[PDB]
Amino acid sequence: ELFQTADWKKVKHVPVIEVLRAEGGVVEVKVSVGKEIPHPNTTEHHIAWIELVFQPEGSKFPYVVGRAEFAAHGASVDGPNTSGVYTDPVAVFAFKAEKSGKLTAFSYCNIHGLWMGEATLSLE
Amino acid sequence: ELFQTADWKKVKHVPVIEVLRAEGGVVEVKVSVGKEIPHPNTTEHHIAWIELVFQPEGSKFPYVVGRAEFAAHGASVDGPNTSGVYTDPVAVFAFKAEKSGKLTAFSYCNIHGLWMGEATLSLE
Amino acid sequence: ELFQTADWKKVKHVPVIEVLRAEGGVVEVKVSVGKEIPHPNTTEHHIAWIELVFQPEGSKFPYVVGRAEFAAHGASVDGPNTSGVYTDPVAVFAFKAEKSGKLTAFSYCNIHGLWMGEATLSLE
Amino acid sequence: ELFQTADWKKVKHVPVIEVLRAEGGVVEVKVSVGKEIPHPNTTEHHIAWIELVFQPEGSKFPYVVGRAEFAAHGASVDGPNTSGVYTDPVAVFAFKAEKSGKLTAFSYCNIHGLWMGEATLSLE
Ligand SMILES: [Fe+3]
Ligand SMILES: [Fe+3]
Ligand SMILES: [Fe+3]
Ligand SMILES: [Fe+3]
To answer: Contact at 8 Å (CB) between A64 and A72?
Structure first.
């Protein structure tokens, strides 16, 4: 087939990793799930967390940078989707670094399993 | 006594809340520890996490918005402070809201205990 | 009033802390929310986590021992309460210790706010 | 080569899964790291957490059962390894199930990377 495509079902779930700042080992990395191309956030269906791993070149092992839980999905004493409060599955991880390396991010849908994305961090 | 003062040690640790955006429900809140006075980030001594709580006016109960773990503090197989990777204790909680309310932030130093901060969310 | 009572609404939410073993600084502490006196675990209503703090005598500061998220509340692609999988809001924290002290536990209902319980750990 | 061997370093780190009870849906799973060969728990080097994933047969997706953070590693204001408080890397996930399935556990050393373990849940 000449026409290439992509499953929307997958795209709305991948943790998209975007480096924002990396001047002089001062790094700010944003991860979101469905940035402008959105995944539902209901009491029954939501992204629960995102986790970010970084492995600097010449490091035998990878390091977890941090983890971000998105705790609120509209539940209240009046029923599901009534609180008004919904946490958005975007996180910014700010960290120091002395070398370039690989970034890997993980996310979780409460009904659609575990997901992963990768990206490169080169020190500009 | 008579001569009031301010503990520098206390401000080094307080989670500071900074609303960045509240227009039209779309809220973004920055929390950070050590903003004005730098808090150590060494394998020995560092800020472990920040949790954001929000209670909209009208609601009898508060909701956790989310939690952010800051996991790297320079430990490698080479020893303490040798990995050159340190997660900065600062998070951005993005979330949808439909009423104004109260923001409480908590935070933890691995040697200096638990910490609390407060702020008002004016959904103007 | 001669007759004393207690709100059931509160009891089903308090983190009950029970020391199981403490021989020689080898400590095992169990925390549950509504042990035989149960709190609902539905996709809309559930206990999200329990956290355990310990402060040993003669320690200026308290230490978080650990935290236990209960991630599964029956949600699946077929709707709420269909997965068959529900995590029980009980956790065991095993840890070492050299002195007696105070235990404090925290729990979270997703629609009924934050809760706390206290207990003493003496080293037998 | 020709002479197969087993890495002692690898077993020190593997999360080991142990079903304790599965009768009638009521499951309890112990996960631990360093069961047979002790893994260091020092401020410098220690196991940060364990996460349990479960995928019942029939279900297209896995569910996180829960996560357990092990937060204390002896750090005090007096320095490294001086608090005399260390969280043992071992958790008990209790949960209700209605079908047999697959158990995957993950775990993290602050200097020796991420780790994975597997086991079958026979809801006999
Ligand atoms: Fe999904
Ligand atoms: Fe401190
Ligand atoms: Fe409740
Ligand atoms: Fe290790």
So the answer is: no
CATH no. for residue B40?
A: 2.60.40.730
**CA of D41 to nearest chain A CA: how many angstroms apart?**
17
* Inter-residue long-range contacts of C14-20, CB under 8 Å, 24+ positions, other chains counted: C14/C107, C14/C115, C14/C116, C14/C117, C15/C50, C15/C105, C15/C106, C15/C107, C15/C115, C15/C116, C15/C117, C16/C117, C17/C52, C17/C103, C17/C105, C17/C117, C17/C118, C17/C119, C18/C119, C19/C103, C19/C119, C19/C121, C20/C92
Find out whether B63 and B53 touch, Cβ atoms under 8 Å.
Answer: yes
Interchain CB contact of A68 with C (< 8 Å):
no
Domain span at residue D97 reads 1-124
Q: What is the spatial distance between Cα A22 and Cα A24, in angstroms, rounded to a whole number?
A: 6
Assess A61–D contact: CB distance below 8 Å, yes or no: yes
Q: Is the CB of D43 less than 8 angstroms away from the CB of B43?
A: yes
Question: Which sign does the torsion angle of CA B64, A80, C115, B55 carry?
Answer: positive
Give the single-character DSSP code of A84. -
Q: Do B44 and D80 touch (CB under 8 A)?
A: yes
Classified as helix, coil or strand, A10 is helix
Query: Is C99's Cβ below 8 Å from some Cβ in D?
Result: yes
**How was this entry determined?**
X-ray
Please list every residue in chain B whose beta carbon sits closer than 8 Å to the beta carbon of residue C48. Answer: 64
Into how many domains does chain B fold? Answer: 1
CB C108 within 8 A of CB C114: yes
| Sign of the alpha-carbon dihedral angle for A39, A40, A43, A44 | negative
